[PDB]
Task: inverse folding
């Protein structure tokens, strides 16, 4: 049963 | 503090090069091949125990690119200062004549993360069996990189790892020969 | 790089660092955002909001901190991200043990003179913590010892050379002793003078 790694997501800046 | 896991990403303009990797205590767990959309485990056996959905890395890099372009404008287009690498050539194990070995070219303490690396045997480029790592993180936010060349030691061969980087004035050739 | 290019470059780096103390018992998350090698803004789970590191990062700290839904996702990341990934990889990272191969060969400090340097090569091991000691006739010699230090090979192995400068005399027995988490009792390799 392979473990699933998670990623963290960058926050978008104001344009 | 026993252990540190780092998710390290970057985006570089104008090259439009973006990388995504995980690090454990200084070793790479995996990276994502952006072009193939593929999770590449540093050791094949890792993929027997863990998995990672590579497509999510591409979404991250797209945000990184957008944020980079905002930061570039915000900085009034201040560019990065080049930091040239220091380069070390060594072998995997002590050298014995005609016992298979591996030359390691360790490229350290540089930014931006762009290099041209060539192995030279007796002054000529060699590509057979070579491999390399992606750009690996450092705590000072410079980069590390390894290049590898399997070889059969001989008194008649000399080697250079040739490294080109924009912080250097000329290509850096680090020499190695059988002592 | 190549391409014969003088064009200015602009770099953005993002690092999510999960720091583990006694496994998952104590966990800290540091998110570092880095422009052109200088960290500009940071999330520290010990704080729970962004802080500007340089003035260039201040707009981001102010904007992200106004978005409480984003802060609450970051504040939970020590659980949903750090502790999760620790459990996913610990069996082949934290628990990884690879025994070193140890060899000894003679060398020279001065090329025109006799062998006077005994090199203990210790290679291919994981993790990096290792103790290497030199003995002469069963007694440690701490004088005259130099080393490469710990060398990371980039492939989840380490190596080191530990060298003893000595004048070999007939009958002496020199032994390199290596202790490492992969082995219960020390590894030893001799050289007879």
Result:
């Amino acid at each position: 049963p392979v473990s699933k790694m998670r990623m963290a997501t960058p926050l978008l800046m104001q344009a | 503090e026993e252990h540190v896991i780092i998710q390290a990403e970057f985006y570089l303009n104008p090259d439009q090069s973006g990388e995504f990797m995980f690090d454990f205590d200084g070793d790479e767990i995996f990276h994502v091949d952006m072009a193939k959309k593929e999770t590449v485990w540093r050791l094949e056996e890792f993929g027997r125990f863990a998995s990672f959905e590579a497509q999510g890395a591409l979404a991250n890099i797209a945000v990184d690119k957008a944020n980079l372009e905002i930061m570039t404008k915000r900085s009034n287009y201040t560019p990065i200062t080049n930091v040239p690498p220091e380069v070390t050539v060594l072998t995997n194990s002590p050298v014995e004549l005609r016992e298979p070995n591996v030359l390691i070219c360790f490229i350290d303490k540089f930014t931006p993360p762009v290099v041209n690396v060539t192995w030279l045997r007796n002054g000529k480029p060699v590509t057979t069996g070579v491999s390399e790592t992606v750009f690996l993180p450092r705590e000072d936010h410079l980069f590390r990189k390894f290049h590898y060349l399997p070889f059969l030691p001989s008194t008649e061969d000399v080697y250079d790892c040739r490294v080109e980087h924009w912080g250097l004035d000329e290509p850096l050739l680090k020499h190695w020969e059988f002592d | 790089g190549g391409s014969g290019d003088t064009r200015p470059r602009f770099l953005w780096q993002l690092k999510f660092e999960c720091h583990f103390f006694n496994g998952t018992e104590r966990v800290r998350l540091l998110e570092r955002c880095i422009y052109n090698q200088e960290e500009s803004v940071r999330f520290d789970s010990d704080v729970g909001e962004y802080r500007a590191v340089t003035e260039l990062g201040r707009p981001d700290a102010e904007y992200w901190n106004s978005q409480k839904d984003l802060l609450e996702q970051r504040r939970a990341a020590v659980d949903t991200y750090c502790r999760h990934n620790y459990g996913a990889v610990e069996s082949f990272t934290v628990q990884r043990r690879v025994e070193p191969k140890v060899t000894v060969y003679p060398s020279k400090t001065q090329p025109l003179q006799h062998h006077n340097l005994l090199v203990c090569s210790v290679s291919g091991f994981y993790p990096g913590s290792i103790e290497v000691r030199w003995f002469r006739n069963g007694q440690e010699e701490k004088a005259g010892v130099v080393s490469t230090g710990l060398i990371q090979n980039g492939d989840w192995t380490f190596q080191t050379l530990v060298m003893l400068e000595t004048v070999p005399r007939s009958g002496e027995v020199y032994t390199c002793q290596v202790e490492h988490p992969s082995v219960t009792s020390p590894l030893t390799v001799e050289w007879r003078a």
Remarks:
- Chain B touches chain A at residues 7, 9, 22, 47-53, 56-57, 59-60, 63-64, 66-67, 70-71 (CB under 8 Å).
- The first helix of chain B runs from residue 46 to 49.
- Chain B has two helices and 14 strands.
